[PDB]
From a paper:
Among the LptD quality control proteases, BepA is different in that it also has chaperone activities and influences the insertion of other OMPs into the outer membrane, and its deletion renders cells sensitive to multiple antibiotics. The primary sequence of BepA indicates that this protein is a member of the M48 family of zinc metalloproteases, of which there are four in E. coli. In addition to the N-terminal M48 protease domain, BepA has a C-terminal tetratricopeptide repeat (TPR) domain.
Helices 8 and 9 contribute a tight turn at the end of the TPR domain, allowing the M48 metallopeptidase domain to be cupped by the pocket formed from TPR motifs 2 and 3. Interaction of the protease domain with the TPR pocket creates a larger negatively charged pocket, which is also noted in the structure presented by Shahrizal et al.. The protease domain of BepA consists of the active site α-helix H4 containing the HEXXH motif, and an active-site plug formed by a loop between helices H6 and H7, residues S246 to P249. The active-site zinc ion is coordinated by H136 and H140 within the HEXXH motif, E201 contributed by helix H5, and H246 on a loop that forms the small α-helical active-site plug. Coordination of the zinc ion by H246 acts as the fourth ligand, therefore suggesting that a rearrangement of the active-site plug should be required for proteolytic activity. We did not observe any density corresponding to positions L146 to I194, and considering that this section is in close proximity to the active site, we expect that it may form a dynamic regulatory region. The importance of residue H246 for BepA function, and the conformation of the active-site plug observed in our crystal structure, suggests that the solved crystal structure may represent a proteolytically inactive form of the protein.
Residue numbers in the entry: 44 to 145, 195 to 484
């Protein structure tokens, strides 16, 4: 099959994936993972396609890829990764399966490790994280009643660990510090998307709290997040206070301060804080938070002003379309609401429903208007997309 045929099949399956409950659509987590992924991709050879990285809520460690550079990572990866370089080693491994066009054979696994460790190193991560991560997987398997799921897909015989140790040993020592974002992402993942063995335990928080400064702050953030989720909003504000004071332009802290404020009907305080943020105009996380606060504060037009632009510039972001729908609903702009929901459905592969909704929007809009022309042309595009997905 061609590269264009690979893109098409990939788009079909990305859409089916987005229609599934386990997909994590958190703005902070999505932005972190794709920023990390793009860093690795920028240092890889034989990249012939865009890459996209997806995070699914699943407490079994695994990672896989499918057509068109689409890499899926289970959230349990954050539980297993002690540092950012270890998380990156798994992502680099996956990228290498893709770039080499490859469960997998012994030879494919070896190649993905060898290519992946070079990408790791070129991207400024510690090569030793790769064998260290694998040794951890084997150590868990050695005394559990069953192996980690990822080993079913990516077999890990001893020879593979030995080869990886050797490659890392041959490269120069490169001790590296995890970004604060790694620890905050880990805290958020295990704390907000907890499930089964994915939990933000007191033991992890206490270990961090006596770690380096980045770990200390992520623990405190973790405590604030958990207070927020247990309806302890005063405690959450108080725990967050020193974090926000030390880094008033940190998007993780601004995001959480917004949710704390909204939870206590302080929409105006939250709006004002976000309007003063320096990176408001360029950081999609801050834009969505502001839109959400405007909605909660009963200013749906201000929300729509943000979200029309946001959805235009972030068309594959299902959060944008959902909030746009809510804003337009609250304005009783019902054709625009229907159209926003249609795009939500189209991203999840539910093309019939998308077309139905757009057809309603078109029918109750002025005949021969510019708006009606826009809806009818979008219906055209979705029908045609439906035809090419027919074979599947
Ligand atoms: Zn593999």
């Amino acid at each position: 099959l061609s590269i264009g045929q690979e893109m098409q099949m990939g788009d079909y399956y990305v859409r089916q994936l987005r229609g599934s409950a386990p997909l994590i659509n958190d703005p902070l987590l999505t932005q972190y993972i794709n920023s990390l992924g793009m860093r690795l991709v920028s240092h890889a050879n034989s990249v012939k396609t865009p890459f996209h990285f997806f995070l699914i809520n699943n407490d079994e460690i695994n990672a896989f890829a499918f057509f068109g550079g689409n890499v899926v990572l289970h959230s349990a990866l954050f539980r297993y990764s002690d540092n950012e370089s270890q998380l990156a080693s798994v992502m680099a491994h996956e990228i290498s399966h893709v770039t080499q066009r490859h469960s997998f054979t012994q030879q494919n696994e070896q190649e993905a490790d060898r290519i992946g460790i070079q990408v790791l190193q070129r991207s400024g991560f510690d090569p030793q994280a790769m064998p260290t991560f694998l040794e951890k997987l084997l150590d868990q398997a050695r005394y559990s009643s069953r192996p980690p799921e990822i080993l079913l897909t990516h077999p890990l015989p001893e020879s593979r660990l030995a080869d990886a140790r050797n490659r890392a040993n041959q490269m120069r020592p490169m001790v590296v510090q995890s970004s604060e974002d790694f620890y905050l992402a880990k805290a958020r993942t295990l704390g907000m998307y907890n499930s089964g063995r994915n939990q933000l335990t007191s033991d992890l928080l206490d270990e961090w709290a006596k770690g380096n400064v980045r770990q200390q702050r992520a623990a405190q953030y973790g405590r604030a997040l958990q207070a927020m989720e247990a309806n302890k909003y005063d405690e959450a504000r108080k725990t967050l206070q020193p974090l926000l004071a030390a880094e008033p332009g940190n998007a993780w802290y601004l995001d959480l301060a917004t949710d704390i404020d909204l939870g206590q009907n302080k929409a105006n305080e939250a709006i004002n804080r976000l309007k003063n943020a320096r990176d408001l105009r360029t950081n999609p996380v801050l834009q969505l938070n502001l839109a959400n606060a405007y909605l909660q504060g009963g200013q749906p037009q201000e929300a729509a002003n943000i979200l029309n632009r946001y959805t235009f510039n972030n068309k594959d972001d299902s959060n944008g379309w959902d909030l746009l729908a809510q804003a337009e609903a609250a304005l009783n702009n019902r054709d625009q609401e229907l159209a926003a929901r249609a795009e939500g459905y189209a991203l999840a592969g539910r093309l019939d429903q998308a077309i139905s909704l757009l057809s309603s929007a078109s029918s109750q809009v002025k005949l021969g208007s510019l708006q009606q022309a826009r809806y009818d042309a979008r219906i055209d595009q979705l029908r045609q997309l439906q035809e090419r997905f027919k074979p599947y």
